[PDB]
Design a binder for this molecule. Structure first.
Ligand SMILES: O=C(N[C@@H]1O[C@H](CO)[C@@H](O)[C@H](O)[C@H]1O)c1ccccc1
Length: 816
């Protein structure tokens, strides 16, 4: 139907149809008369997967022969979403499969909805890993993603009585056609035990063993015949585990304890919990991965001599979660390979690089020493030794500066002794990067200032990106097509080409097409809400959307205050015209985060009042988007008009949702925080709705002391809202329901919601004004899309490759 989705050749469609029928018969063991729609999805998935395997085998064969420097991206999260459409797009098979399924009397889109999200991540950090894998394959890098195969990913969110309920995400229930189990590469991981000293070095003995079994998932590049690997470890009990009838039975059932390591993703978005099971997950991925790395290095054309290790291996630590890679690599080199400390350390530093993903103090990993002492006794010893040698370097560089020593130490003294994992990562890496220019500067100026002064060369910026494959071509084919009509298809792997669209900003045909694509997206999403959730919205209204995990710093509460302001203004002057809005807010709250759960309840409670007020009519609707996840993002983002990016300046390291909205034709209201700053710089500040305190203003307010009451006293509209919340206007049966929210806003608000309220409301008025002028709204949209090229993860990854890993990207095809 549409050109960007590839050709539907006669030979291809015929071949797909017969391979589809073959899988249905031989693989699913069904015939057309008994086949469930799920069977049809699985038949298609197998048919598409077949087209991957030859390229997958030859790519990995190619790396063996050419022996390039290998990149290992270590993460505890890979937020992959669905795989079927992505694979079709990257292989140029989408139209052919659409045609083949049509002729079989099947709707492919319906089949696509049957696939479970691989929800092996919480939010931005996990999704970044997924975009990065796509870009690394597209850029022809010999890259491997290494993580954990959680049996249960991020919980499914149900809203019941306005409250979040969690249900297990049993994503493997029906099986995963995309993975290949590789039991031949099963590896032992050690826990507990004790350290013995002998004549020839330390030995780690009396350990418990858990097995690590890899599962490989293919990662196809965009139309370059490259297929890389994401390898995820699953925990398995050794067969002699724990080995009376009750005793026998119990010994078998106790195998569950070892396998619990890979059972479930920790649902903490921006917060730290020193739980033993989490530490075990962290070491499990690190120990198994490093053995795989070393095996592959020895089986190379060089391996014996580890001098060349950093020339053949790069290890990227996705935050501090896999930080145990540093002392684990030292352990292996020193204890097992018998290298001297100094050489081992040189190899380690040159091998490892660390990316920081937040400055929020509560999110930083600080493990109690007694935990590491029990679980990983050898690693604690190595960490102590790293610390002593590091602090000797500090002492020599800043003689007499005793407080610098305590500030820089990897060991934090106190009630309980802790290891600061961030300090470990800086010491043991040759590069440290933030994820947006302002974030990277904040690192050098505040939290890692001491380390920057000691080793300035180590610190870098790598502004985040998103993949234009999933986040344009896949989720917004209509916009991809109208763009390709003007400028061709090469922008898909070279997003800077979107700049050519600037010479169409006054093109009346293009303006009409951009606005038409948006309207179609909005109509489709408006229908989705009715069909799947029985809610009725006005598709002519401005689609005002804030989708992201629920946290105080992201200030969903500031959005709530605006919503209530609009409602109160309508109730004050009912017969006055206002630009109609559909306000959509969505995101999951971490199970133990009480405030975040209260915020969700507030949003739904506002909806209950606003959506049923006959005086409001269809002029204002407030909807909480349930179970926000990658697949829902692919639907809502193309439908959005207004992107809410309203974190307190200095708190959102980068953001990536922001970039997704920019690429898909929404305008942005936001603070000068994270990547918003660079987005506004690229598009031009006049083409952005910027408001609020800058980082410097926040700092000034902190020095003076933030007094929320001042704002309450001086803003009558704000006062009205707080009184409504307090008095039970939004909870008539439970008048005090929101007392905690009011108390926090008035007395302990770390994120200064009130301080930005006035500028926010005023900026929102400017948004409404522009929306009243469809032509000028769309021209500003075009100027955003046209300048979104910097925010492709292809650019981000090319910068990592050149400036950190020391490898050159390649756009050349491998043979088909
Ligand atoms: O999700 C996290 N950070 C997010 O990473 C994204 C990708 O770099 C950024 O875009 C977000 O701003 C940041 O909050 C996070 C959460 C807890 C600990 C460490 C990191």
């Amino acid at each position: 139907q549409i050109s960007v989705r590839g050709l539907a050749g006669v030979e291809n469609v015929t071949e797909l149809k017969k391979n589809f029928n073959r899988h249905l018969h031989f693989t699913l063991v069904k015939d057309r008369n008994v086949a469930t729609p799920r069977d049809y999805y699985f038949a298609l998935a197998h048919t598409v997967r077949d087209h991957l395997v030859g390229r997958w085998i030859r790519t990995q064969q190619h790396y063996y022969e050419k022996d390039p420097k290998r990149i290992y991206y270590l993460s505890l999260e890979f937020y992959m979403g669905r795989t079927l459409q992505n694979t079709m797009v990257n292989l140029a098979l989408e139209n052919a499969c659409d045609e083949a399924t049509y002729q079989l009397g099947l709707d492919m889109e319906e089949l696509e909805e049957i696939e479970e999200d691989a929800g092996l991540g919480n939010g931005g950090l996990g999704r970044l890993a997924a975009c990065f894998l796509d870009s690394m394959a597209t850029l022809g890098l010999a890259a491997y993603g290494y993580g954990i195969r959680y049996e249960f990913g991020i919980f499914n969110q149900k809203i019941c009585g306005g409250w979040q309920m969690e249900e297990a995400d049993d994503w493997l229930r029906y099986g995963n056609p995309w993975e290949k189990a590789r039991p031949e590469f099963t590896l032992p991981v050690h826990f507990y035990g004790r350290v013995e000293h002998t004549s020839q070095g330390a030995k780690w003995v009396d350990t418990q063993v858990v097995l690590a079994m890899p599962y490989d998932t293919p990662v196809p590049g965009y139309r370059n015949n490259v297929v890389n690997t994401m390898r995820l470890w699953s925990a398995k009990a050794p067969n002699d585990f724990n080995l009376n009838v009750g005793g026998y039975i119990q010994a078998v059932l106790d195998r569950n304890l070892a396998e619990n390591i890979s059972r479930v993703l920790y649902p903490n978005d921006n917060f730290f919990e020193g739980k033993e099971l989490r530490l075990k997950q962290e070491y499990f991925v690190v120990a198994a991965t490093l053995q795989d790395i070393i095996r592959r290095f020895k089986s190379s054309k060089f391996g014996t001599n580890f001098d060349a290790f950093p020339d053949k291996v790069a290890i990227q630590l996705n935050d501090t979660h896999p930080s145990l890679a540093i002392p684990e690599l030292m352990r292996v080199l020193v204890d097992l390979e018998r290298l001297d400390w100094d050489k081992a350390w040189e190899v380690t530093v040159k091998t490892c690089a660390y990316t920081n993903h937040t400055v929020l103090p509560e999110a930083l990993e600080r493990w109690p020493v007694h935990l590491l002492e029990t679980l990983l006794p050898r690693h604690l010893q190595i960490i102590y030794e790293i610390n002593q040698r590091f602090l000797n370097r500090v002492a020599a560089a800043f003689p007499g500066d005793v407080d610098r020593l305590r500030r820089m130490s990897l060991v934090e003294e106190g009630a309980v002794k802790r290891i600061n994992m961030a300090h470990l990562c800086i010491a043991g890496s040759h590069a440290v990067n933030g994820v947006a220019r302002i974030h990277s500067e904040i690192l050098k100026k505040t939290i890692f200032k001491d380390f920057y002064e000691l080793e300035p060369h180590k610190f870098q910026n790598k502004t985040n990106g998103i993949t234009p494959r999933r986040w344009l071509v896949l989720c917004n084919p209509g916009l991809a097509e109208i763009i390709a009509e003007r400028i061709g298809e090469e922008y898909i792997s070279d997003l800077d080409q979107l700049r050519k669209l600037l010479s169409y900003v006054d093109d009346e045909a293009f303006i009409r097409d951009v606005a038409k694509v948006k309207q179609e997206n909005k109509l489709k999403f408006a229908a989705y809400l009715e069909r799947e959730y029985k809610v009725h919205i006005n598709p002519n209204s401005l689609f005002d959307v804030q989708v992201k995990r629920i946290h105080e710093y992201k200030r969903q509460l500031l959005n709530c205050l605006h919503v209530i302001t609009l409602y109160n203004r309508i109730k004050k002057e009912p017969n006055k015209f206002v630009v109609p809005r559909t306000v959509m807010i969505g995101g999951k709250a971490a199970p133990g985060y009480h405030m975040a759960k209260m915020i969700i309840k507030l949003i739904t409670a506002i909806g209950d009042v606003v959506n049923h007020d006959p005086v409001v009519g269809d002029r204002l609707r407030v909807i909480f988007l349930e179970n926000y996840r990658v697949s829902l993002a692919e639907k809502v983002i193309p439908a959005a008009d207004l992107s809410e990016q309203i974190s307190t300046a200095g708190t959102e390291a980068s953001g990536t949702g922001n970039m997704k909205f920019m690429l898909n034709g929404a305008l942005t209201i936001g603070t000068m925080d994270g990547a918003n700053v660079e987005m506004a710089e690229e598009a031009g500040e006049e083409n952005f709705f910027i408001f609020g305190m800058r980082v410097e203003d926040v700092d000034r307010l902190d020095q003076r002391g933030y007094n929320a009451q001042e704002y309450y006293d001086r803003i009558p509209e704000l006062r009205q809202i707080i009184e409504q919340l307090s008095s039970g206007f939004f909870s008539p049966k439970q008048p005090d329901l929101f007392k905690d929210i009011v108390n926090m806003l008035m007395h302990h608000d770390r994120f200064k919601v009130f301080a930005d309220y006035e500028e926010y409301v005023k900026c929102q008025e400017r948004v409404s004004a522009l929306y009243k002028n469809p032509r000028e709204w769309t021209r500003m949209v075009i100027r955003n899309i046209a300048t979104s090229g910097k925010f492709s993860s292809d650019r981000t990854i090319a910068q990592y490759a050149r400036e950190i890993w020391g490898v050159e990207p390649s756009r050349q095809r491998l043979p088909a």
